[PDB]
Amino acid sequence: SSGLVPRGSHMKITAARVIITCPGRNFVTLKIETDQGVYGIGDATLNGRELSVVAYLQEHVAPCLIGMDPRRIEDIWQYVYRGAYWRRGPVTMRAIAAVDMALWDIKAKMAGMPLYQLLGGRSRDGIMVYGHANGSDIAETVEAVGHYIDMGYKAIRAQTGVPGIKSLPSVTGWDTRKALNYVPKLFEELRKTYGFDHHLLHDGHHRYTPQEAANLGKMLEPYQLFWLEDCTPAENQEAFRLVRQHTVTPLAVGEIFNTIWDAKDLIQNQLIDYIRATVVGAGGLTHLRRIADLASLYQVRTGCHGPTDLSPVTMGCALHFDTWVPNFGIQEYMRHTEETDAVFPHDYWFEKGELFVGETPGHGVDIDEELAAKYPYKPAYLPVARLEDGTMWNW
Amino acid sequence: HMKITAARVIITCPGRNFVTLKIETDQGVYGIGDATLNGRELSVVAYLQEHVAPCLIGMDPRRIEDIWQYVYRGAYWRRGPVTMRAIAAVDMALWDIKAKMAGMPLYQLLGGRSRDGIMVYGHANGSDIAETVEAVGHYIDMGYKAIRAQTGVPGIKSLPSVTGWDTRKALNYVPKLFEELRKTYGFDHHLLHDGHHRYTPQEAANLGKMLEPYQLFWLEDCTPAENQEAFRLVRQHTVTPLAVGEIFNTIWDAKDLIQNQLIDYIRATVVGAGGLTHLRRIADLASLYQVRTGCHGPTDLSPVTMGCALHFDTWVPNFGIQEYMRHTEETDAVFPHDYWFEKGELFVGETPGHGVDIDEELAAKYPYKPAYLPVARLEDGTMWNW
Ligand SMILES: O=C(O)[C@@H](O)[C@@H](O)[C@H](O)[C@H](O)CO
Numbered sequence: 170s171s172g173l174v175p176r177g178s179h180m181k182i183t184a185a186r187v188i189i190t191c192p193g194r195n196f197v198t199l200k201i202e203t204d205q206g207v208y209g210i211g212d213a214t215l216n217g218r219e220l221s222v223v224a225y226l227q228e229h230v231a232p233c234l235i236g237m238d239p240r241r242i243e244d245i246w247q248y249v250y251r252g253a254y255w256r257r258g259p260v261t262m263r264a265i266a267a268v269d270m271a272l273w274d275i276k277a278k279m280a281g282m283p284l285y286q287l288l289g290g291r292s293r294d295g296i297m298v299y300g301h302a303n304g305s306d307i308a309e310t311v312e313a314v315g316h317y318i319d320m321g322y323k324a325i326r327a328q329t330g331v332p333g334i335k336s337l338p339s340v341t342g343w344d345t346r347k348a349l350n351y352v353p354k355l356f357e358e359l360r361k362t363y364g365f366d367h368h369l370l371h372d373g374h375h376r377y378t379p380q381e382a383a384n385l386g387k388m389l390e391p392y393q394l395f396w397l398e399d400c401t402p403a404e405n406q407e408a409f410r411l412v413r414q415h416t417v418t419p420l421a422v423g424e425i426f427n428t429i430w431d432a433k434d435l436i437q438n439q440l441i442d443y444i445r446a447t448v449v450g451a452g453g454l455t456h457l458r459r460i461a462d463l464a465s466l467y468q469v470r471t472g473c474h475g476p477t478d479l480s481p482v483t484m485g486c487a488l489h490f491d492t493w494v495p496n497f498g499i500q501e502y503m504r505h506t507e508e509t510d511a512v513f514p515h516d517y518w519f520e521k522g523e524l525f526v527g528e529t530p531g532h533g534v535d536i537d538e539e540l541a542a543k544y545p546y547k548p549a550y551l552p553v554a555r556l557e558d559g560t561m562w563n564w
Numbered sequence: 565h566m567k568i569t570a571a572r573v574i575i576t577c578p579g580r581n582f583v584t585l586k587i588e589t590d591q592g593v594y595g596i597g598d599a600t601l602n603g604r605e606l607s608v609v610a611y612l613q614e615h616v617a618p619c620l621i622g623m624d625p626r627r628i629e630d631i632w633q634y635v636y637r638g639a640y641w642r643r644g645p646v647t648m649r650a651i652a653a654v655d656m657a658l659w660d661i662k663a664k665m666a667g668m669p670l671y672q673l674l675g676g677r678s679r680d681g682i683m684v685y686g687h688a689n690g691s692d693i694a695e696t697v698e699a700v701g702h703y704i705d706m707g708y709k710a711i712r713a714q715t716g717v718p719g720i721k722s723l724p725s726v727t728g729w730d731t732r733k734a735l736n737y738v739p740k741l742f743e744e745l746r747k748t749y750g751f752d753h754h755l756l757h758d759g760h761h762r763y764t765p766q767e768a769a770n771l772g773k774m775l776e777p778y779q780l781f782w783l784e785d786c787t788p789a790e791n792q793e794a795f796r797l798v799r800q801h802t803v804t805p806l807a808v809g810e811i812f813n814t815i816w817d818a819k820d821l822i823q824n825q826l827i828d829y830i831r832a833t834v835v836g837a838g839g840l841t842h843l844r845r846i847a848d849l850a851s852l853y854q855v856r857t858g859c860h861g862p863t864d865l866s867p868v869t870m871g872c873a874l875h876f877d878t879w880v881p882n883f884g885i886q887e888y889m890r891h892t893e894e895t896d897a898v899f900p901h902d903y904w905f906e907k908g909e910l911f912v913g914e915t916p917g918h919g920v921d922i923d924e925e926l927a928a929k930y931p932y933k934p935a936y937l938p939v940a941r942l943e944d945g946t947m948w949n950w
Pocket residue numbers: 216372374424474475476478501551640
């Protein structure tokens with residue numbers, strides 16, 4: 170135990186500080202300190218819009234937290250969620266997520282337990298991950314998939330450039346017919362080359378209409394994909410209906426979701442197989458648990474998004490979540506830079522296509538503030554996409 | 565072509581906080597847009613100043629739609645209070661430039677005028693029924709056609725203030741307010757009530773039925789609506805008209821409430837829901853089901869929003885009502901505008917643009933001052949919906 174407060178005594182948040190660092194890329198971290206001595210940290214990173222969350226926390230949320238009882242995780246979650254008045258949203262839920270992660274960090278430290286024990290204990294040993302096999306064309310993407318296979322990955326996401334298709338935001342091009350003609354040939358070549366033992370994933374990256382996604386999903390059926398992800402924009406939760414009606418290719422969505430309200434109909438109408446919402450994107454452990462539980466009712470599984478723009482603090486929480494959650498499906502894993510790992514020392518590790526969470530009380534991650542200050546913030550944007558005629562599209 | 569040369573964020577507190585975006589061009593003409601998000605103001609300041617504004621530099625400001633789609637889709641993480649306030653500010657400023665370049669007041673570009681004056685409602689508040697009745701009388705005396713009546717409830721009570729709430733106490737008391745209002749003033753005046761997210765769907769249904777004899781103009785925000793099915797039970801059980809949406813920020817928050825015919829008035833605003841570009845889409849969807857606009861309009865939407873809202877209200881075919889809370893004199897001076905109030909109606913002027921501007925020199929004399937919205941808890945301490 171990090172130290173329990175005496176029975177009948179109070180505990181207060183004394184500080185809620187935002188720390189910004191760029192050890193390879195931008196990360197925002199909230200550190201909640203207490204009068205007991207124990208502290209907790211949470212990820213607040215919102216890629217390409219980082220400083221909006223910094224201000225949300227520093228100027229608005231943090232001053233409200235001071236003096237509050239950090240043990241009251243649920244109450245504080247409801248306070249910042251309901252109390253915002255303007256509810257939901259990428260910036261809002263990142264701030265909430267940062268607070269929630271930091272508070273669960275504190276509770277696990279005080280309990281003298283790794284976080285997964287507080288959530289209900291372990292349901293599995295290792296956490297299956299997928300890696301990112303990218304190529305400019307099919308031949309190259311095929312070779313990249315082989316590399317991940319050699320490395321012992323059980324699951325691989327395969328993405329290829331399409332011939333004829335191409336810090337401020339980089340502008341990229343897109344054409345759907347070109348992709349529809351080419352993408353199924355990638356998966357054909359992959360199965361010809363490697364057979365059917367490995368899980369193969371594809372990210373449609375919001376590019377298709379529902380009918381087009383249905384078309385693509387059908388064309389991919391002979392290749393038995395693990396999932397086709399983010400096939401069509403999903404602000405309208407009815408957008409997956411035609412896709413689900415027409416294909417048995419499994420469907421995943423939700424890396425950009427921030428509350429259960431973004432996913433409730435996709436889940437209850439059985440339009441998806443994997444929910445991709447994350448601890449940082451969707452309001453911390455407190456809220457992600459709700460999302461996972463609703464999904465479980467329909468046998469929908471978790472497939473947490475996990476690019477490098479979710480810091481190791483997020484990964485730590487994600488792995489504790491993954492270790493416990495009964496309807497675990499898979500965990501995305503893109504490796505952070507060495508500098509990032511140094512700034513955020515953590516008790517999780519990778520081995521032969523699986524991540525494993527450690528037994529350190531808390532979520533097992535910390536932040537080296539002295540080292541973090543050596544890497545100053547540097548603006549960086551996500552790309553945008555335009556159609557061939559110049560139409561603004563979904564990158 | 566024509567280019568954006570700057571997109572600057574201006575912050576001022578002439579009575580309360582306002583955030584404004586000013587888009588300047590290499591053709592001299594500029595436009596302004598409201599970015600104010602009450603109680604979280606500085607988050608939008610950063611969203612704009614640190615992220616969106618640098619992307620705008622060099623873009624063609626004539627391309628309103630393209631820029632909207634750029635900031636909307638390009639964000640990658642879509643929708644949200646902060647996100648859409650930033651988008652709205654850009655959109656208002658670009659429509660301002662377009663109308664200035666056209667030599668026309670903004671309502672002309674939207675489709676021209678559909679009406680003369682804009683019916684408003686004001687806020688008659690009281691600590692109890694007697695006081696609230698007196699206040700409605702005052703608004704009636706001032707020539708208001710429509711009045712929102714809110715009473716404190718006996719037994720129910722900068723950092724956020726913590727207020728109390730008890731549903732049973734309110735269900736027992738609120739209908740009596742409207743009984744007394746109709747007994748005292750008759751049925752000529754439109755009477756409105758804001759449930760302010762306090763009730764479950766069944767409780768809202770119960771309240772709605774109890775309010776039926778009093779013929780309300782609307783019962784607003786009766787139950788939290790993140791779940792768009794939340795209004796189903798209410799609509800099934802009462803003919804009291806329903807309004808919702810001041811806190812919505814995209815059409816995705818309202819599409820089912822509209823298409824399933826669960827509401828009569830959509831309350832989304834120019835600043836809340838992504839500018840003229842997006843609010844037009846919301847109003848048009850609403851029109852298919854005879855749902856009307858009821859734009860939210862408290863003091864925390866700046867005169868820039870009010871200018872845009874009034875241009876919108878002057879054109880939009882399915883207009884219902886416009887909320888109006890008066891800004892301070894200081895605010896009117898900081899934001900020179902061509903709209904005015906007379907005998908229960910607002911009127912937009914004919915100045916090219918949305919008709920609002922900002923005096924930056926004067927704005928600098930009122931520094932930002934942190935202020936929070938209240939929170940509500942139940943009698944047992946449960947965090948609730950203020
Ligand atoms: O599934 C994925 O990994 C991608 O969709 C993400 O890498 C996404 O593009 C980034 O997280 C955006 O910050």
